[PDB]
């Protein structure tokens, strides 16, 4: 939570400086009892440190004097020792592309094998391989005088996302026996409630 843990409002770019960055808890969703949270998962991430930087501001944690020698100026404040790198996603290539491909679910990771309870289906997707930003600019004069000055042009940054979801569903029967149905009741009472 960059908004709550960084009162500086200046440690990370404007994208996240007042937002929350979430990472999927694959460990928790895979250890789920029923496996409804996630029965199909594809991850592919990459990053490296492009530039190394220093953070200004008083160091809240005292650098232990056992780890360095101060030099001749025995009353010298040690420089800032909070290092933060600039991340980078390296090359974006269509060989590493993960979408525009058909994926067939046969065996799920959990016990729920792709069954859409309550006739709904949640699709979470992140794709940062199309992060290009359009820069649109408009002249401040009704028609531009053929001389460029930054004050006579307004600059705007716009971003675009485009999707096309496709699905193949299979119709299924559930014989409402005893033992069963009571198991469904212990699973989700609202399942029987929405049926009859």
């Amino acid at each position, epitope marked *: 939570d960059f908004k709550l843990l960084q009162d500086n409002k200046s440690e990370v770019p404007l994208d996240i400086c007042q937002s929350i960055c979430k990472y999927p808890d694959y460990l928790q969703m895979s250890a789920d009892a029923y496996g409804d949270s996630m029965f199909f998962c594809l991850r592919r991430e990459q990053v490296f440190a492009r530039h190394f930087w220093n953070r200004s501001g*008083t160091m809240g944690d*005292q*650098l232990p*004097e056992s780890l360095y020698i*101060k030099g001749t100026d*025995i*009353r*010298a*404040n040690p420089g800032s020792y909070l290092y933060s790198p600039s991340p980078s996603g390296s090359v974006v290539t269509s060989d590493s592309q993960l979408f525009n491909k058909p994926y067939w679910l046969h065996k799920a990771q959990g016990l729920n094998n792709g069954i859409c309870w309550h006739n709904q289906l949640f699709l979470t997707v992140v794709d940062t391989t199309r992060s290009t930003n359009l820069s649109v600019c408009a002249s401040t004069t009704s028609s531009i005088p053929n001389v460029y000055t930054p004050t006579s042009f307004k600059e705007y940054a716009r971003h675009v996302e485009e999707f096309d979801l496709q699905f193949i569903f299979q119709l299924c029967k559930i014989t409402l026996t005893t033992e069963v149905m009571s198991y469904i009741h212990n699973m989700n009472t609202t399942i029987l409630e929405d049926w009859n």
Partner: antibody
Framework: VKLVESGGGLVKPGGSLKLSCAAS????????MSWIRQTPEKRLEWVAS????????YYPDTVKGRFTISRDNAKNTLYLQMSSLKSEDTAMFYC????????????????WGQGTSVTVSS | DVVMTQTPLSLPVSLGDQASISCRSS???????????LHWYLQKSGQSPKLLIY???NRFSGVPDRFSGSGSGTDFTLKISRVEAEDLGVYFC?????????FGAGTKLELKR
């Protein structure tokens, strides 16, 4: 905030003596400490100073061999180990707090103790 | 090493008047660093000294607006706008720019009667 000097008495010349100082109300291990004495003629002199961690100490040349400042950050205590004192070192010894670790040792002592007078004479 | 000279050693004044204590050093007192490290302390009778001004012109926490430090290089001054009852004591002038940290010699702010 409390800086309390203590220890130990008025002792013979050429003998040792240990001075203690208990701190309260602030992160003791975060500040550089110092000893400042006031002569019987009521003039103030700088005696010693030790870093936030007990690794860096410095004194004037007038006390280079006799005094040894130390500190226990776990006990929040400051110590001045005086040895082979002469009668000219008679003074009211004050335990003072300087700048924190994240500042250059600016050398101003904002908080002073109550003082412990030691005198050395035959 | 460095010597501190205060003028005068005894400054008798009446309440409500202005007070001025001078302090001169033998060396430049300007550090090989941003600021100049000259300070003013106040000691009252039988009470440990207490910090009054740090770094030539910065009032310590809880110091009234009447106290005003000024100066640079080797010439420094301390001005009290309206001398009050609880301002009487020895004023010390310290330098910590150069090792050893040195200060003298005591300036008695006494009452005029």
């Amino acid at each position: 905030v409390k800086l309390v000097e203590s220890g130990g008495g008025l002792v013979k010349p050429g003998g040792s003596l240990k001075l203690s100082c208990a701190a309260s109300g602030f992160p003791f291990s975060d500040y550089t400490m110092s000893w400042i004495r006031q002569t019987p003629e009521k003039r103030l002199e700088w005696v010693a100073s030790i870093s936030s961690g007990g690794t860096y100490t410095y004194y004037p040349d007038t006390v280079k061999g006799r005094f040894t400042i130390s500190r226990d950050n776990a006990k929040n205590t400051l110590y001045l180990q005086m040895s082979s004192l002469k009668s000219e070192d008679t003074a009211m010894f004050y335990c003072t707090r300087a700048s924190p670790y994240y500042d250059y040792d600016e050398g101003y002592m904002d908080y002073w103790g109550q003082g412990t007078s030691v005198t050395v004479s035959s | 090493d460095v010597v501190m000279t205060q003028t005068p050693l005894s400054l008798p004044v009446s309440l409500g008047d202005q007070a001025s204590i001078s302090c001169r050093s033998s060396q430049s007192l300007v550090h090989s660093n941003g600021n100049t490290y000259l300070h003013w302390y106040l000691q009252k009778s039988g009470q440990s000294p207490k910090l009054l001004i740090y770094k030539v012109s910065n009032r310590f926490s809880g110091v009234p607006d009447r106290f005003s430090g000024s100066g640079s290089g080797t010439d420094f001054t301390l001005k009290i706008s309206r001398v009050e009852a609880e301002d009487l004591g020895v004023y010390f002038c310290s330098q910590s720019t150069h090792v050893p940290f040195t200060f003298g010699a005591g300036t008695k702010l006494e009452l005029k009667r």
